Amino acid sequence: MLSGLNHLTLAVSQLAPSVAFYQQLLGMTLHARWDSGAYLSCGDLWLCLSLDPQRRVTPPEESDYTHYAFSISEADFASFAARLEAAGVAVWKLNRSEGASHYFLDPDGHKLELHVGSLAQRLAACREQPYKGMVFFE
Amino acid sequence: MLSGLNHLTLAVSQLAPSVAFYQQLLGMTLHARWDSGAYLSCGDLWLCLSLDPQRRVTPPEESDYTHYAFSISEADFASFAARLEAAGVAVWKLNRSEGASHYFLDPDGHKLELHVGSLAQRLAACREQPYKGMVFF
Ligand SMILES: C[C@@H]1O[C@@H]1P(=O)(O)O
Ligand SMILES: C[C@@H]1O[C@@H]1P(=O)(O)O
Ligand SMILES: [K+]
Ligand SMILES: [K+]
Ligand SMILES: [Mn+2]
Ligand SMILES: [Mn+2]
């Protein structure tokens, strides 16, 4: 039986710039670093950066919708997003679904998101306004 | 400040086979499905499948090391991995780091992992034998 996400590993092209992004701009806790990677945490999330020569800096129009969303409070959301924009962090999508979201890119083009709201909130909102063809399971 | 992972979203090329993979082979809870996606949960993890025409079925030698690992108990690991093998789910590497891991591919080539062990456990093991050039904070 699976009990949750154990860790998220991101391939990065340059270790020090990527560590600075996740530690300083996103406020994650840096636990350890070595010449091929780094270990960070964000609440319960175990984040791994892996230095990978196969990684290319990918513009958002050349990658699919796969993306990673981090939780933030309603009160912190707007100034956090504004600080990222002032830091030159690129936006890859305008928010369109329920709950505050800021869609931004990491230094290698990994697609990230800040989101306010849980799965329960999304399901309740979708029951009120169902997506095309949407069905629910008890 | 950020408080954790809110959700993981995977682009998929065929919605029904991917739902069957995550719901039936991995045992995740299917909450909702629509013409272009699905919502599942795995413990506290909110997983979204997004039907994407752009999604390529990507061989593991043409993608980088980005991958997603799910937690499983030590008692459950061996038989869960064996069921994936019997279902023909591909393995993309052998375990070379501390703590039981099974490295497998989803139908579109997303790199997945079953793993027993926490961050605290990995940090404990690294303090006994650090990786190359390792610095501790
Ligand atoms: C919540 C799932 O990722 C989708 P959204 O970000 O389009 O809402
Ligand atoms: C835990 C970080 O992904 C690396 P590993 O799976 O190679 O140990
Ligand atoms: K949203
Ligand atoms: K391992
Ligand atoms: Mn999202
Ligand atoms: Mn891993």
PDB file of C-alpha atoms and ligand atoms in Angstrom:
ATOM      1  CA  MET A   1       0.000   0.000   0.000  1.00  0.00           C
ATOM      2  CA  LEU A   2       1.328   3.403  -0.992  1.00  0.00           C
ATOM      3  CA  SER A   3       1.074   5.994   1.770  1.00  0.00           C
ATOM      4  CA  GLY A   4       2.084   9.227   0.011  1.00  0.00           C
ATOM      5  CA  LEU A   5       4.880  11.000  -1.832  1.00  0.00           C
ATOM      6  CA  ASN A   6       8.277   9.943  -0.487  1.00  0.00           C
ATOM      7  CA  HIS A   7      10.422  12.491  -2.364  1.00  0.00           C
ATOM      8  CA  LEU A   8      10.511  14.653  -5.485  1.00  0.00           C
ATOM      9  CA  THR A   9      13.737  14.600  -7.519  1.00  0.00           C
ATOM     10  CA  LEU A  10      14.482  17.325 -10.086  1.00  0.00           C
ATOM     11  CA  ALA A  11      17.320  17.105 -12.589  1.00  0.00           C
ATOM     12  CA  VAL A  12      19.256  20.389 -12.696  1.00  0.00           C
ATOM     13  CA  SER A  13      21.932  21.677 -15.073  1.00  0.00           C
ATOM     14  CA  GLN A  14      23.780  23.893 -12.549  1.00  0.00           C
ATOM     15  CA  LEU A  15      23.687  22.919  -8.897  1.00  0.00           C
ATOM     16  CA  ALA A  16      24.533  26.179  -7.141  1.00  0.00           C
ATOM     17  CA  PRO A  17      21.981  28.313  -9.080  1.00  0.00           C
ATOM     18  CA  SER A  18      19.257  25.715  -8.462  1.00  0.00           C
ATOM     19  CA  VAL A  19      20.047  25.446  -4.735  1.00  0.00           C
ATOM     20  CA  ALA A  20      19.881  29.243  -4.453  1.00  0.00           C
ATOM     21  CA  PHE A  21      16.485  29.228  -6.197  1.00  0.00           C
ATOM     22  CA  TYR A  22      14.873  26.654  -3.905  1.00  0.00           C
ATOM     23  CA  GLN A  23      16.587  27.742  -0.671  1.00  0.00           C
ATOM     24  CA  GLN A  24      16.614  31.544  -0.980  1.00  0.00           C
ATOM     25  CA  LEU A  25      13.730  32.425  -3.303  1.00  0.00           C
ATOM     26  CA  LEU A  26      11.342  29.688  -2.147  1.00  0.00           C
ATOM     27  CA  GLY A  27      12.508  29.561   1.467  1.00  0.00           C
ATOM     28  CA  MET A  28      13.106  25.788   1.603  1.00  0.00           C
ATOM     29  CA  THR A  29      15.471  24.275   4.182  1.00  0.00           C
ATOM     30  CA  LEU A  30      18.877  23.167   2.874  1.00  0.00           C
ATOM     31  CA  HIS A  31      20.000  20.017   4.703  1.00  0.00           C
ATOM     32  CA  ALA A  32      22.991  18.811   2.687  1.00  0.00           C
ATOM     33  CA  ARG A  33      24.763  19.327  -0.606  1.00  0.00           C
ATOM     34  CA  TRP A  34      27.363  17.336  -2.516  1.00  0.00           C
ATOM     35  CA  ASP A  35      28.992  17.621  -5.891  1.00  0.00           C
ATOM     36  CA  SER A  36      26.108  15.892  -7.696  1.00  0.00           C
ATOM     37  CA  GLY A  37      23.053  17.008  -5.759  1.00  0.00           C
ATOM     38  CA  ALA A  38      21.357  18.577  -2.773  1.00  0.00           C
ATOM     39  CA  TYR A  39      18.663  17.642  -0.254  1.00  0.00           C
ATOM     40  CA  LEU A  40      16.053  20.187   0.823  1.00  0.00           C
ATOM     41  CA  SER A  41      12.760  20.065   2.698  1.00  0.00           C
ATOM     42  CA  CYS A  42       9.549  22.101   2.479  1.00  0.00           C
ATOM     43  CA  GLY A  43       7.274  21.037   5.303  1.00  0.00           C
ATOM     44  CA  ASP A  44       6.917  17.264   4.861  1.00  0.00           C
ATOM     45  CA  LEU A  45       8.250  17.398   1.288  1.00  0.00           C
ATOM     46  CA  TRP A  46      11.679  15.858   0.664  1.00  0.00           C
ATOM     47  CA  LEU A  47      13.107  17.641  -2.399  1.00  0.00           C
ATOM     48  CA  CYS A  48      16.187  16.294  -4.205  1.00  0.00           C
ATOM     49  CA  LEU A  49      18.180  18.274  -6.762  1.00  0.00           C
ATOM     50  CA  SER A  50      20.215  16.018  -9.060  1.00  0.00           C
ATOM     51  CA  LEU A  51      23.011  17.438 -11.225  1.00  0.00           C
ATOM     52  CA  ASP A  52      22.311  15.827 -14.617  1.00  0.00           C
ATOM     53  CA  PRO A  53      24.257  16.456 -17.856  1.00  0.00           C
ATOM     54  CA  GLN A  54      21.157  15.300 -19.782  1.00  0.00           C
ATOM     55  CA  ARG A  55      19.145  18.268 -18.447  1.00  0.00           C
ATOM     56  CA  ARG A  56      18.574  21.204 -20.787  1.00  0.00           C
ATOM     57  CA  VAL A  57      17.128  24.619 -19.951  1.00  0.00           C
ATOM     58  CA  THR A  58      13.689  24.012 -21.436  1.00  0.00           C
ATOM     59  CA  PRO A  59      11.413  26.887 -22.488  1.00  0.00           C
ATOM     60  CA  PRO A  60       7.838  26.307 -21.316  1.00  0.00           C
ATOM     61  CA  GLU A  61       6.487  25.969 -24.867  1.00  0.00           C
ATOM     62  CA  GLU A  62       8.743  22.915 -25.335  1.00  0.00           C
ATOM     63  CA  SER A  63       7.529  20.947 -22.273  1.00  0.00           C
ATOM     64  CA  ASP A  64       4.167  19.381 -21.425  1.00  0.00           C
ATOM     65  CA  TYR A  65       1.820  20.292 -18.547  1.00  0.00           C
ATOM     66  CA  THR A  66       3.637  18.173 -15.923  1.00  0.00           C
ATOM     67  CA  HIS A  67       4.178  20.459 -12.931  1.00  0.00           C
ATOM     68  CA  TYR A  68       4.711  20.629  -9.159  1.00  0.00           C
ATOM     69  CA  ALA A  69       2.560  22.782  -6.860  1.00  0.00           C
ATOM     70  CA  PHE A  70       3.542  23.979  -3.373  1.00  0.00           C
ATOM     71  CA  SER A  71       1.089  24.954  -0.641  1.00  0.00           C
ATOM     72  CA  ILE A  72       0.848  28.535   0.626  1.00  0.00           C
ATOM     73  CA  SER A  73      -1.646  30.386   2.790  1.00  0.00           C
ATOM     74  CA  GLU A  74      -4.122  32.893   1.403  1.00  0.00           C
ATOM     75  CA  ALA A  75      -2.466  35.613   3.503  1.00  0.00           C
ATOM     76  CA  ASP A  76       1.061  34.964   2.174  1.00  0.00           C
ATOM     77  CA  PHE A  77       0.161  34.298  -1.459  1.00  0.00           C
ATOM     78  CA  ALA A  78       0.117  37.734  -3.080  1.00  0.00           C
ATOM     79  CA  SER A  79       3.348  39.120  -1.647  1.00  0.00           C
ATOM     80  CA  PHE A  80       5.168  35.817  -2.227  1.00  0.00           C
ATOM     81  CA  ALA A  81       4.183  35.877  -5.903  1.00  0.00           C
ATOM     82  CA  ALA A  82       5.158  39.553  -6.160  1.00  0.00           C
ATOM     83  CA  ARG A  83       8.588  38.831  -4.687  1.00  0.00           C
ATOM     84  CA  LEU A  84       9.148  36.076  -7.241  1.00  0.00           C
ATOM     85  CA  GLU A  85       8.190  38.376 -10.102  1.00  0.00           C
ATOM     86  CA  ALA A  86      10.503  41.104  -8.802  1.00  0.00           C
ATOM     87  CA  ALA A  87      13.273  38.468  -8.711  1.00  0.00           C
ATOM     88  CA  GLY A  88      12.909  37.862 -12.448  1.00  0.00           C
ATOM     89  CA  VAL A  89      11.170  34.502 -12.030  1.00  0.00           C
ATOM     90  CA  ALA A  90       9.148  33.812 -15.181  1.00  0.00           C
ATOM     91  CA  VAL A  91       5.394  33.103 -15.254  1.00  0.00           C
ATOM     92  CA  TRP A  92       4.279  30.253 -17.528  1.00  0.00           C
ATOM     93  CA  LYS A  93       0.483  30.301 -17.033  1.00  0.00           C
ATOM     94  CA  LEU A  94      -2.312  32.615 -15.912  1.00  0.00           C
ATOM     95  CA  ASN A  95      -4.500  31.197 -13.150  1.00  0.00           C
ATOM     96  CA  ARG A  96      -7.802  29.774 -14.455  1.00  0.00           C
ATOM     97  CA  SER A  97      -8.978  27.211 -11.871  1.00  0.00           C
ATOM     98  CA  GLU A  98     -10.419  27.777  -8.414  1.00  0.00           C
ATOM     99  CA  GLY A  99      -8.107  28.887  -5.627  1.00  0.00           C
ATOM    100  CA  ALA A 100      -5.196  31.302  -5.856  1.00  0.00           C
ATOM    101  CA  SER A 101      -2.357  30.017  -8.059  1.00  0.00           C
ATOM    102  CA  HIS A 102       0.923  31.469  -9.353  1.00  0.00           C
ATOM    103  CA  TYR A 103       2.541  29.421 -12.152  1.00  0.00           C
ATOM    104  CA  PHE A 104       6.297  30.000 -12.359  1.00  0.00           C
ATOM    105  CA  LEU A 105       9.477  28.457 -13.790  1.00  0.00           C
ATOM    106  CA  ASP A 106      12.634  27.232 -12.032  1.00  0.00           C
ATOM    107  CA  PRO A 107      16.089  27.940 -13.580  1.00  0.00           C
ATOM    108  CA  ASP A 108      15.921  24.835 -15.812  1.00  0.00           C
ATOM    109  CA  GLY A 109      12.308  25.341 -16.855  1.00  0.00           C
ATOM    110  CA  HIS A 110      10.674  22.936 -14.397  1.00  0.00           C
ATOM    111  CA  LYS A 111       7.049  24.059 -14.177  1.00  0.00           C
ATOM    112  CA  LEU A 112       6.098  25.089 -10.628  1.00  0.00           C
ATOM    113  CA  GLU A 113       2.990  26.450  -8.915  1.00  0.00           C
ATOM    114  CA  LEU A 114       1.990  28.143  -5.663  1.00  0.00           C
ATOM    115  CA  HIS A 115      -1.560  27.135  -4.733  1.00  0.00           C
ATOM    116  CA  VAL A 116      -4.048  28.005  -2.000  1.00  0.00           C
ATOM    117  CA  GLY A 117      -6.516  25.160  -1.512  1.00  0.00           C
ATOM    118  CA  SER A 118      -6.871  21.424  -0.971  1.00  0.00           C
ATOM    119  CA  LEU A 119      -8.167  18.553  -3.054  1.00  0.00           C
ATOM    120  CA  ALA A 120     -11.378  18.606  -0.994  1.00  0.00           C
ATOM    121  CA  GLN A 121     -11.925  22.259  -1.925  1.00  0.00           C
ATOM    122  CA  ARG A 122     -11.321  21.501  -5.615  1.00  0.00           C
ATOM    123  CA  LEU A 123     -13.764  18.577  -5.600  1.00  0.00           C
ATOM    124  CA  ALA A 124     -16.491  20.652  -3.923  1.00  0.00           C
ATOM    125  CA  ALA A 125     -15.969  23.460  -6.456  1.00  0.00           C
ATOM    126  CA  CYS A 126     -16.068  20.975  -9.336  1.00  0.00           C
ATOM    127  CA  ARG A 127     -19.362  19.520  -8.117  1.00  0.00           C
ATOM    128  CA  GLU A 128     -20.843  23.034  -8.335  1.00  0.00           C
ATOM    129  CA  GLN A 129     -19.352  23.694 -11.808  1.00  0.00           C
ATOM    130  CA  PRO A 130     -18.327  20.371 -13.404  1.00  0.00           C
ATOM    131  CA  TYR A 131     -15.641  20.248 -16.062  1.00  0.00           C
ATOM    132  CA  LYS A 132     -16.717  18.826 -19.411  1.00  0.00           C
ATOM    133  CA  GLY A 133     -17.606  15.161 -18.938  1.00  0.00           C
ATOM    134  CA  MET A 134     -16.787  15.170 -15.232  1.00  0.00           C
ATOM    135  CA  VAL A 135     -17.903  12.242 -13.064  1.00  0.00           C
ATOM    136  CA  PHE A 136     -17.288  11.666  -9.354  1.00  0.00           C
ATOM    137  CA  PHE A 137     -16.588   8.416  -7.482  1.00  0.00           C
ATOM    138  CA  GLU A 138     -17.818   7.572  -3.976  1.00  0.00           C
TER     139      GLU A 138
ATOM    140  CA  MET B   1       6.228  30.612   3.437  1.00  0.00           C
ATOM    141  CA  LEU B   2       5.566  27.333   1.674  1.00  0.00           C
ATOM    142  CA  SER B   3       4.154  24.481   3.744  1.00  0.00           C
ATOM    143  CA  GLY B   4       4.640  21.395   1.556  1.00  0.00           C
ATOM    144  CA  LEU B   5       3.631  19.839  -1.730  1.00  0.00           C
ATOM    145  CA  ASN B   6       0.126  20.861  -2.731  1.00  0.00           C
ATOM    146  CA  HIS B   7      -0.291  18.569  -5.736  1.00  0.00           C
ATOM    147  CA  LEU B   8       1.627  16.674  -8.430  1.00  0.00           C
ATOM    148  CA  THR B   9       0.384  16.897 -12.028  1.00  0.00           C
ATOM    149  CA  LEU B  10       1.435  14.449 -14.750  1.00  0.00           C
ATOM    150  CA  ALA B  11       0.752  14.996 -18.450  1.00  0.00           C
ATOM    151  CA  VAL B  12      -0.612  11.794 -20.002  1.00  0.00           C
ATOM    152  CA  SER B  13      -1.206  10.772 -23.612  1.00  0.00           C
ATOM    153  CA  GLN B  14      -4.158   8.377 -23.040  1.00  0.00           C
ATOM    154  CA  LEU B  15      -6.401   9.088 -20.078  1.00  0.00           C
ATOM    155  CA  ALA B  16      -8.044   5.692 -19.508  1.00  0.00           C
ATOM    156  CA  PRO B  17      -4.805   3.621 -19.503  1.00  0.00           C
ATOM    157  CA  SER B  18      -3.150   6.103 -17.131  1.00  0.00           C
ATOM    158  CA  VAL B  19      -6.121   6.125 -14.735  1.00  0.00           C
ATOM    159  CA  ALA B  20      -6.031   2.315 -14.759  1.00  0.00           C
ATOM    160  CA  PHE B  21      -2.304   2.393 -13.980  1.00  0.00           C
ATOM    161  CA  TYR B  22      -2.505   4.734 -10.991  1.00  0.00           C
ATOM    162  CA  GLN B  23      -5.835   3.487  -9.628  1.00  0.00           C
ATOM    163  CA  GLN B  24      -5.587  -0.268 -10.247  1.00  0.00           C
ATOM    164  CA  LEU B  25      -1.863  -1.114 -10.391  1.00  0.00           C
ATOM    165  CA  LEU B  26      -0.709   1.430  -7.786  1.00  0.00           C
ATOM    166  CA  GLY B  27      -3.898   1.342  -5.701  1.00  0.00           C
ATOM    167  CA  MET B  28      -4.492   5.089  -5.556  1.00  0.00           C
ATOM    168  CA  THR B  29      -7.967   6.460  -4.856  1.00  0.00           C
ATOM    169  CA  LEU B  30      -9.815   7.800  -7.906  1.00  0.00           C
ATOM    170  CA  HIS B  31     -11.956  10.797  -6.905  1.00  0.00           C
ATOM    171  CA  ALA B  32     -13.054  12.311 -10.211  1.00  0.00           C
ATOM    172  CA  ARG B  33     -12.515  12.006 -13.936  1.00  0.00           C
ATOM    173  CA  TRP B  34     -13.425  14.303 -16.833  1.00  0.00           C
ATOM    174  CA  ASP B  35     -12.798  14.423 -20.571  1.00  0.00           C
ATOM    175  CA  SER B  36      -9.253  15.741 -20.128  1.00  0.00           C
ATOM    176  CA  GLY B  37      -8.067  14.624 -16.696  1.00  0.00           C
ATOM    177  CA  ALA B  38      -8.485  12.866 -13.386  1.00  0.00           C
ATOM    178  CA  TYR B  39      -7.925  13.515  -9.683  1.00  0.00           C
ATOM    179  CA  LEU B  40      -6.507  10.791  -7.450  1.00  0.00           C
ATOM    180  CA  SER B  41      -5.091  10.696  -3.948  1.00  0.00           C
ATOM    181  CA  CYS B  42      -2.343   8.622  -2.331  1.00  0.00           C
ATOM    182  CA  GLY B  43      -2.365   9.301   1.383  1.00  0.00           C
ATOM    183  CA  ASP B  44      -1.954  13.077   1.593  1.00  0.00           C
ATOM    184  CA  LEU B  45      -0.740  13.291  -2.014  1.00  0.00           C
ATOM    185  CA  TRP B  46      -3.085  14.949  -4.494  1.00  0.00           C
ATOM    186  CA  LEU B  47      -2.247  13.521  -7.938  1.00  0.00           C
ATOM    187  CA  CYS B  48      -3.634  15.081 -11.119  1.00  0.00           C
ATOM    188  CA  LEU B  49      -3.555  13.386 -14.516  1.00  0.00           C
ATOM    189  CA  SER B  50      -3.827  15.883 -17.374  1.00  0.00           C
ATOM    190  CA  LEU B  51      -4.638  14.666 -20.885  1.00  0.00           C
ATOM    191  CA  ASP B  52      -2.008  16.415 -23.033  1.00  0.00           C
ATOM    192  CA  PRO B  53      -1.691  16.024 -26.829  1.00  0.00           C
ATOM    193  CA  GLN B  54       1.928  17.126 -26.415  1.00  0.00           C
ATOM    194  CA  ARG B  55       2.841  14.169 -24.172  1.00  0.00           C
ATOM    195  CA  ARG B  56       5.362  11.840 -25.804  1.00  0.00           C
ATOM    196  CA  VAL B  57       5.775   8.216 -24.781  1.00  0.00           C
ATOM    197  CA  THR B  58       9.333   8.841 -23.643  1.00  0.00           C
ATOM    198  CA  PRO B  59      11.966   6.088 -23.401  1.00  0.00           C
ATOM    199  CA  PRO B  60      13.942   6.366 -20.148  1.00  0.00           C
ATOM    200  CA  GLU B  61      17.251   6.878 -21.968  1.00  0.00           C
ATOM    201  CA  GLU B  62      15.865  10.101 -23.517  1.00  0.00           C
ATOM    202  CA  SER B  63      14.626  11.752 -20.302  1.00  0.00           C
ATOM    203  CA  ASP B  64      16.676  13.112 -17.416  1.00  0.00           C
ATOM    204  CA  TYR B  65      16.734  11.888 -13.798  1.00  0.00           C
ATOM    205  CA  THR B  66      13.623  13.851 -12.695  1.00  0.00           C
ATOM    206  CA  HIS B  67      11.448  11.283 -10.930  1.00  0.00           C
ATOM    207  CA  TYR B  68       8.666  10.850  -8.352  1.00  0.00           C
ATOM    208  CA  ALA B  69       8.949   8.453  -5.400  1.00  0.00           C
ATOM    209  CA  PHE B  70       6.070   7.032  -3.349  1.00  0.00           C
ATOM    210  CA  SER B  71       6.295   5.810   0.235  1.00  0.00           C
ATOM    211  CA  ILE B  72       5.682   2.176   1.124  1.00  0.00           C
ATOM    212  CA  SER B  73       6.289   0.172   4.284  1.00  0.00           C
ATOM    213  CA  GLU B  74       9.103  -2.363   4.561  1.00  0.00           C
ATOM    214  CA  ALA B  75       6.598  -5.210   4.949  1.00  0.00           C
ATOM    215  CA  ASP B  76       4.673  -4.264   1.784  1.00  0.00           C
ATOM    216  CA  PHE B  77       7.559  -3.404  -0.562  1.00  0.00           C
ATOM    217  CA  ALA B  78       8.622  -6.811  -1.886  1.00  0.00           C
ATOM    218  CA  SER B  79       5.190  -8.082  -2.921  1.00  0.00           C
ATOM    219  CA  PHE B  80       4.119  -4.707  -4.332  1.00  0.00           C
ATOM    220  CA  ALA B  81       7.233  -4.652  -6.544  1.00  0.00           C
ATOM    221  CA  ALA B  82       6.630  -8.276  -7.556  1.00  0.00           C
ATOM    222  CA  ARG B  83       3.076  -7.476  -8.654  1.00  0.00           C
ATOM    223  CA  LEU B  84       4.368  -4.611 -10.795  1.00  0.00           C
ATOM    224  CA  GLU B  85       6.921  -6.955 -12.401  1.00  0.00           C
ATOM    225  CA  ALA B  86       4.204  -9.530 -13.118  1.00  0.00           C
ATOM    226  CA  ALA B  87       2.045  -6.793 -14.688  1.00  0.00           C
ATOM    227  CA  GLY B  88       4.865  -6.000 -17.138  1.00  0.00           C
ATOM    228  CA  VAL B  89       5.718  -2.601 -15.690  1.00  0.00           C
ATOM    229  CA  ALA B  90       9.182  -1.608 -16.869  1.00  0.00           C
ATOM    230  CA  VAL B  91      12.160  -0.987 -14.567  1.00  0.00           C
ATOM    231  CA  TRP B  92      14.485   1.865 -15.529  1.00  0.00           C
ATOM    232  CA  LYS B  93      17.346   1.308 -13.043  1.00  0.00           C
ATOM    233  CA  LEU B  94      18.641  -0.944 -10.280  1.00  0.00           C
ATOM    234  CA  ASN B  95      18.661   0.310  -6.698  1.00  0.00           C
ATOM    235  CA  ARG B  96      22.050   1.856  -5.887  1.00  0.00           C
ATOM    236  CA  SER B  97      21.260   3.965  -2.797  1.00  0.00           C
ATOM    237  CA  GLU B  98      20.271   3.316   0.795  1.00  0.00           C
ATOM    238  CA  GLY B  99      16.828   1.895   1.508  1.00  0.00           C
ATOM    239  CA  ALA B 100      14.650  -0.422  -0.572  1.00  0.00           C
ATOM    240  CA  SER B 101      13.737   1.142  -3.909  1.00  0.00           C
ATOM    241  CA  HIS B 102      11.956  -0.100  -7.025  1.00  0.00           C
ATOM    242  CA  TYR B 103      12.417   2.194 -10.039  1.00  0.00           C
ATOM    243  CA  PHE B 104       9.580   1.834 -12.547  1.00  0.00           C
ATOM    244  CA  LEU B 105       7.949   3.625 -15.476  1.00  0.00           C
ATOM    245  CA  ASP B 106       4.368   4.778 -15.996  1.00  0.00           C
ATOM    246  CA  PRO B 107       2.685   4.233 -19.401  1.00  0.00           C
ATOM    247  CA  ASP B 108       4.082   7.525 -20.782  1.00  0.00           C
ATOM    248  CA  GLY B 109       7.561   7.006 -19.366  1.00  0.00           C
ATOM    249  CA  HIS B 110       7.268   9.173 -16.265  1.00  0.00           C
ATOM    250  CA  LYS B 111      10.006   7.942 -13.949  1.00  0.00           C
ATOM    251  CA  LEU B 112       8.561   6.591 -10.684  1.00  0.00           C
ATOM    252  CA  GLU B 113       9.991   4.966  -7.556  1.00  0.00           C
ATOM    253  CA  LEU B 114       8.806   2.937  -4.598  1.00  0.00           C
ATOM    254  CA  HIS B 115      11.001   3.713  -1.608  1.00  0.00           C
ATOM    255  CA  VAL B 116      11.201   2.667   2.041  1.00  0.00           C
ATOM    256  CA  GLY B 117      12.919   5.338   4.139  1.00  0.00           C
ATOM    257  CA  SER B 118      12.665   9.007   5.104  1.00  0.00           C
ATOM    258  CA  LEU B 119      14.819  12.073   4.558  1.00  0.00           C
ATOM    259  CA  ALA B 120      16.005  11.746   8.168  1.00  0.00           C
ATOM    260  CA  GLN B 121      17.061   8.170   7.412  1.00  0.00           C
ATOM    261  CA  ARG B 122      19.008   9.192   4.285  1.00  0.00           C
ATOM    262  CA  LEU B 123      20.726  12.047   6.147  1.00  0.00           C
ATOM    263  CA  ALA B 124      21.664   9.611   8.927  1.00  0.00           C
ATOM    264  CA  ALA B 125      23.237   7.268   6.365  1.00  0.00           C
ATOM    265  CA  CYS B 126      25.071  10.108   4.599  1.00  0.00           C
ATOM    266  CA  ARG B 127      26.697  11.232   7.864  1.00  0.00           C
ATOM    267  CA  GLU B 128      28.326   7.793   8.176  1.00  0.00           C
ATOM    268  CA  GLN B 129      29.463   7.741   4.525  1.00  0.00           C
ATOM    269  CA  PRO B 130      29.126  11.101   2.766  1.00  0.00           C
ATOM    270  CA  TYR B 131      28.782  11.390  -0.983  1.00  0.00           C
ATOM    271  CA  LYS B 132      31.561  12.983  -3.016  1.00  0.00           C
ATOM    272  CA  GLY B 133      32.222  16.556  -1.928  1.00  0.00           C
ATOM    273  CA  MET B 134      29.402  16.473   0.610  1.00  0.00           C
ATOM    274  CA  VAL B 135      28.784  19.458   2.898  1.00  0.00           C
ATOM    275  CA  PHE B 136      26.300  19.285   5.787  1.00  0.00           C
ATOM    276  CA  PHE B 137      23.915  21.991   7.015  1.00  0.00           C
TER     277      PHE B 137
HETATM  278  C1  LIG C   1      -4.694  21.097  -9.785  1.00  0.00           C
HETATM  279  C2  LIG C   1      -4.099  20.434 -11.041  1.00  0.00           C
HETATM  280  O1  LIG C   1      -2.866  20.926 -11.639  1.00  0.00           O
HETATM  281  C3  LIG C   1      -4.148  21.198 -12.247  1.00  0.00           C
HETATM  282  P1  LIG C   1      -4.421  23.028 -12.187  1.00  0.00           P
HETATM  283  O2  LIG C   1      -3.127  23.624 -11.645  1.00  0.00           O
HETATM  284  O3  LIG C   1      -4.619  23.307 -13.667  1.00  0.00           O
HETATM  285  O4  LIG C   1      -5.631  23.458 -11.391  1.00  0.00           O
HETATM  286  C1  LIG C   2      16.582  10.209  -3.148  1.00  0.00           C
HETATM  287  C2  LIG C   2      16.978  10.962  -4.435  1.00  0.00           C
HETATM  288  O1  LIG C   2      16.376  10.541  -5.699  1.00  0.00           O
HETATM  289  C3  LIG C   2      17.776  10.228  -5.387  1.00  0.00           C
HETATM  290  P1  LIG C   2      17.842   8.380  -5.296  1.00  0.00           P
HETATM  291  O2  LIG C   2      16.486   7.745  -5.586  1.00  0.00           O
HETATM  292  O3  LIG C   2      18.785   8.022  -6.421  1.00  0.00           O
HETATM  293  O4  LIG C   2      18.332   7.799  -3.972  1.00  0.00           O
HETATM  294  K     K C   3      -5.957  27.554  -9.302  1.00  0.00           K
HETATM  295  K     K C   4      17.249   3.640  -2.499  1.00  0.00           K
HETATM  296 MN    MN C   5      -1.609  22.701 -10.712  1.00  0.00          MN
HETATM  297 MN    MN C   6      14.633   8.723  -5.775  1.00  0.00          MN
END
